[PDB]
Design a protein around this nucleic acid. Structure first.
Ligand SMILES: [K+]
Ligand SMILES: [K+]
Ligand SMILES: [K+]
Ligand SMILES: [K+]
Ligand SMILES: [K+]
Ligand SMILES: [Mg+2]
Ligand SMILES: [Mg+2]
Ligand SMILES: [Mg+2]
Ligand SMILES: [Mg+2]
Ligand SMILES: [Mg+2]
Ligand SMILES: [Mg+2]
Ligand SMILES: [Mg+2]
Ligand SMILES: [Mg+2]
Ligand SMILES: [Mg+2]
Ligand SMILES: [Mg+2]
Ligand SMILES: [Mg+2]
Ligand SMILES: [Mg+2]
Ligand SMILES: [Mg+2]
Ligand SMILES: [Mg+2]
Ligand SMILES: [Mg+2]
Ligand SMILES: [Mg+2]
Ligand SMILES: [Zn+2]
Lengths: 110, 102, 118, 144, 155, 52, 49
RNA sequence: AACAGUGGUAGGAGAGCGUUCUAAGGGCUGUGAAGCCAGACCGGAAGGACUGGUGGAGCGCUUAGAAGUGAGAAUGCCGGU
RNA sequence: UAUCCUUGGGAGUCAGACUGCGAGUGAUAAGAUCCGUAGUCGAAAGGGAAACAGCCCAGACCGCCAGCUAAGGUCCCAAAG
RNA sequence: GACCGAUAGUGAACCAGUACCGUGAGGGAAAGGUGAAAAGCACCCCGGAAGGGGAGUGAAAGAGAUCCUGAAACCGUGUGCCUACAAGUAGUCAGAGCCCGUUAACGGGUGAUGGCGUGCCUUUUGUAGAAUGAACCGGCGAGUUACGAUCCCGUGCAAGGUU
């Protein structure tokens, strides 16, 4: 029995978010939170909120025990990109991709 | 006991009860075929043909007339706009060796 | 009437990509390099269907020579002996005997040996 | 189709001793290379190692005809500029008899992965004794 | 074509130096939005066969009707009033099931209105008979008066 | 200097192997039970060497 | 004759040749005009005579 | 049936596959159309089916007709990455 | 032995390369240059010459885990003394 | 209407001669689709919110506002086979082992190892070429039409044929 939470279109590059996602994938939910709290990355707080949302969903909507949960799936998908243009020398303009991410956490009992 | 028989343009080592694919024979499914060109007989009593074993034959049963799995022949010549694509399915006769009459 | 590109282009290219399954990296993913490799594979497959018949004959001759020299004959003389005795067993079958029924092979080898000593 | 192929399950490898004493370097090497590759076996299969193990003794007693002892030069390059080093056949046999035999045979083996694997079955020793009593090696005479 | 498409006058960029492909107009046919190369242009498709071929065609098609027993000749066809019900009953009486071409000698207003609304039932004057109409409709209901008018012209 | 050929998906992935984060050096705070970084004062309860 | 069974007289109609539609047609690429020179250019060729 | 032949650039000739539209016949489709996604099927090639998933309303087949009828390359154009 | 000629429809080609032989130019040089003559390449895959359009052998409709040969080879790489 | 169907058709299906660019004349886009009906998600839970998970509406929410369908490039997650002594135009032919079970076929996936093998196109006497073109994917993108001439073929009539 799985509980899922998703933060869609978070303004954080998928590559950057994925660095943090790899730390918590497969970990027990209690440990995962302590890893996010002590990992100094932009994604940590974002992913932590998604993980806590999933735990709440597991506990509330499915009467699962929060202490027995494990992160069975954790991945970051690419969201739509905001395209921007920085002025460079000689009148040239260069593109800037303000990327977004879809952060998904699935928890389940071990 | 096994025998070496020439059929098609080729030779096959056969034992009784074995199922062999050979070049297409003029024979319907179910019919009994005979192979008169037996070159060698093995097993206990060893006959050596010179080139054939005199009088020896192998009877067998046509199981199926079919065509092999398709191969796509594609050839080209670089830079000379020359392509050629051609399908091939080689006919065969599936045969079950009944008796080796050495 | 206007003829839209439609679905014909995608259908044709997908067929090629399916033939390129298992190719490395882009060669199973991108049509142009996939298309090149499938074309190249065609030439190779043709060439090798003709090379197959040489490789197996090469293998059979090597095996016959090994088995022949276990009977104190080189492959050259063994084959000459068989021809003089009128034996039409081919190298595929001789190699098979050498591997699967060595006693049978020795009988043929002895036949050849008789002819050579004549 | 039908042609049987040797595989790791089917292969049984003998151990052979070859005495280099008085033998010509190249003529002994070519026959040893045949044995290492498995060409003497009717079950020979091109893509598998079907050969036997060979022990060579008395490597120091290998012979060369003509003036090869002094004139045959073994080169190597260290991949540094002007890094071409050389050795005469005399020096090699005196100080590196195993290397000399191994070089000759390695040159006569296939060059790729399986050829390197075959070479691992070769054992060349300086004197008359070898440490492979346990393998029960048979004496193998050269066939000219 | 590229002349008729809006805009496209000026050269998009200088011929040399930019590293782009050389272009002459943003309405060139390789441009999105650009002119079409060739393509449909207004024209007529009509052409004329020799008179004798025209007559041979219509005679061939009529004679084919007779070979198939799809020519129904009526002493006369007179409807009292325009009434599709009346016409539909007449066609059923004659075992007319699929399409039928009705050919009257002269303009028969009562018949034209009664048959106008029935699918696959066409009404025509002897003048108006034509190859496509006859071939299209399976049965040919011609009046005796109309047969002579058609014969008068063709014969 | 500019890339002479594009980087394959395999070469890109092989490079990024070492582009990784490490798990933080955590140790449970024996006072309040929250996880802190070893040798750092506990943010949650404010304890250190068993003192708040 | 039936509108669904029309047949032209044999040899009365032929299909047009469409050049520059691939190698296999035989008029691919250069579309029958050979290589370069005035005759291969669009609106190429010299005036009659 | 016999015999013979069957490399190919420029180029000539022939026979075809497929796409859009029209006509005429005959069909399919809310018990699921087109499209899309798989598959180990079929044809000498271009190509064509069958089954399942997605999709949620249109579409084949036969003969003929008409073409904006087939793309991998133009430092091609546009979009996306 | 099966071409050849006439008429008509449609072409492409006018940069050729090397090899052998007979000559010129050159220095009896040039993978040079220009002709004659034959071949191969161009437009010809296969085998040999380590690799190697033009040299040697020989012309690929397609399948076969059949056989005989050509040039070239047969101690090992690598088929065969 | 044997005209187009959102890169098409007007530049413009949409608040287009607009946005934007130019001192100015002037140049000049991109951008359609919930559902039959808003019945447009009451209420609950995590969150500051965004965004989610339930529950409801609906035939369908994997129809929830860039809301029919949703291809490829490209980015990920899981893992059946293989991979750290190996020299690779990446395939092809041979081939164990392991893992599967199909449009049922002398099956499918992977591939230790062996043999062979220097992309495609254009242009050239000759290109793997260190000559040219292509980052990749998708769409679009090039012998057509009118009127004349001539030849072949088909048809009608024929010393006549045709308007
Ligand atoms: K030229
Ligand atoms: K369905
Ligand atoms: K040329
Ligand atoms: K669309
Ligand atoms: K493209
Ligand atoms: Mg500035
Ligand atoms: Mg297209
Ligand atoms: Mg203008
Ligand atoms: Mg051609
Ligand atoms: Mg050109
Ligand atoms: Mg087009
Ligand atoms: Mg020259
Ligand atoms: Mg070439
Ligand atoms: Mg031929
Ligand atoms: Mg021979
Ligand atoms: Mg050998
Ligand atoms: Mg538009
Ligand atoms: Mg709808
Ligand atoms: Mg040049
Ligand atoms: Mg150029
Ligand atoms: Mg480039
Ligand atoms: Zn604490």
């Amino acid at each position: 029995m799985q509980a899922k939470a998703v933060a869609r279109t978070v303004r954080i590059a998928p590559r950057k978010a994925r660095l943090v996602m790899d730390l918590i994938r497969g970990k027990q939910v209690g440990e995962a939170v302590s890893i996010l709290n002590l990992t100094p990355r932009a994604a940590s707080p974002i992913i932590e909120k998604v993980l806590k949302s999933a735990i709440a969903n597991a506990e509330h909507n499915y009467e699962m025990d929060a202490n027995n949960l494990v992160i069975s799936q954790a991945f970051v998908d690419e969201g739509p990109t905001l395209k921007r243009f920085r002025p460079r020398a000689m009148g040239r303009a260069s593109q800037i991709n303000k990327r977004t991410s879809h952060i998904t956490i699935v928890v389940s009992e071990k | 006991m096994y025998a070496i028989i020439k059929t098609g343009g080729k030779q096959i080592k056969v034992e009784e009860g074995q199922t062999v694919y050979i070049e297409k024979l003029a024979a319907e499914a179910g019919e009994t075929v005979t192979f008169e060109d037996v070159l060698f007989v093995g097993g206990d009593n060893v006959k050596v043909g010179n080139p054939t074993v005199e009088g020896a034959t192998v009877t067998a049963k046509v199981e199926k007339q079919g065509r092999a799995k398709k191969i796509t022949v594609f050839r080209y010549k670089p830079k000379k706009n020359v392509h050629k694509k051609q399908g091939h399915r080689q006919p065969y006769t599936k045969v079950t060796i009944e008796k080796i009459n050495a | 009437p206007r003829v839209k590109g439609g679905t014909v282009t995608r259908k044709r290219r997908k067929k090629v990509l399916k033939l390129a399954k298992g190719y490395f990296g882009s060669k199973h993913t991108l049509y142009k390099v996939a298309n090149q490799q499938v074309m190249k594979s065609g030439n190779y497959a043709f060439r090798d269907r003709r090379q197959k018949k040489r490789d197996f004959r090469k293998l059979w001759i090597t095996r016959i020579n090994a088995a022949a020299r276990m009977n104190g004959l080189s492959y050259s003389r063994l084959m000459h002996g068989l021809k003089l005795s009128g034996i039409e067993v081919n190298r595929k079958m001789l190699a098979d005997l050498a591997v699967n029924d060595l006693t049978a092979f020795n009988q043929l080898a002895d036949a050849a040996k008789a002819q050579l000593n004549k | 189709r039908t042609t049987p192929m040797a595989n790791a399950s089917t292969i049984e490898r003998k151990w052979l001793v070859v005495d280099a004493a008085g033998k010509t370097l190249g003529r002994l090497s070519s026959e040893v290379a045949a044995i290492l590759r498995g060409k003497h076996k009717p079950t020979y299969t091109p893509h598998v190692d079907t050969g036997d193990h060979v022990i060579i003794i008395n490597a120091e007693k290998i012979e060369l005809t003509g003036k090869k002892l002094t004139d045959k030069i073994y080169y190597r390059h260290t991949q540094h500029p002007g890094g071409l080093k050389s050795r005469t056949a005399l020096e090699m046999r005196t100080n590196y008899p195993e290397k000399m035999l191994e070089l000759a045979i390695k040159g006569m083996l296939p060059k790729g992965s399986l050829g390197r694997q075959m070479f691992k079955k070769l054992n060349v020793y300086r004197g008359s004794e070898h440490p492979h009593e346990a393998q029960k090696p048979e004496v193998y005479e050269l066939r000219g | 074509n590229r002349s008729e498409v809006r805009g496209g006058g000026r050269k998009p960029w200088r011929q040399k130096g930019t590293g782009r492909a050389r272009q002459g107009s943003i309405r060139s046919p390789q441009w999105r939005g650009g002119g079409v190369v060739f393509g449909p242009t207004p024209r007529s498709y009509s052409y004329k066969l020799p008179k004798k071929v025209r007559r041979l065609a219509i005679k061939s098609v009529l004679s084919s009707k007779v070979i198939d027993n799809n020519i129904i000749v009526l002493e006369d066809l007179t409807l009292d009033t325009a009434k599709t019900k009346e016409m539909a009953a007449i066609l059923k009486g004659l075992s007319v099931e699929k399409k039928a071409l009705i050919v009257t000698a002269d303009a028969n207003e009562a018949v034209a209105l009664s048959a106008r609304n029935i699918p696959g039932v066409t009404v025509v004057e002897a003048n108006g008979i034509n190859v496509l109409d006859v071939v299209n409709h399976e049965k040919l209901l011609i009046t005796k008066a109309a047969v002579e008018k058609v014969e008068e012209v063709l014969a | 200097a500019v890339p002479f050929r594009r980087t394959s998906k395999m070469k890109k992935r092989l490079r990024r192997t070492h582009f990784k984060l490490n798990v933080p050096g955590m140790t449970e705070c024996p006072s309040c039970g929250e996880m802190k970084l070893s040798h750092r004062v506990c943010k949650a309860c404010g304890s250190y060497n068993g003192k708040d | 004759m039936k509108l669904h069974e029309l047949k032209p007289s044999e040899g009365s109609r032929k299909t047009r040749n469409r050049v520059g539609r691939g190698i296999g047609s035989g008029n691919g690429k250069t579309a029958g005009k050979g290589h370069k020179g005035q005759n291969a250019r669009s609106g190429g060729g010299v005036r009659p005579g």
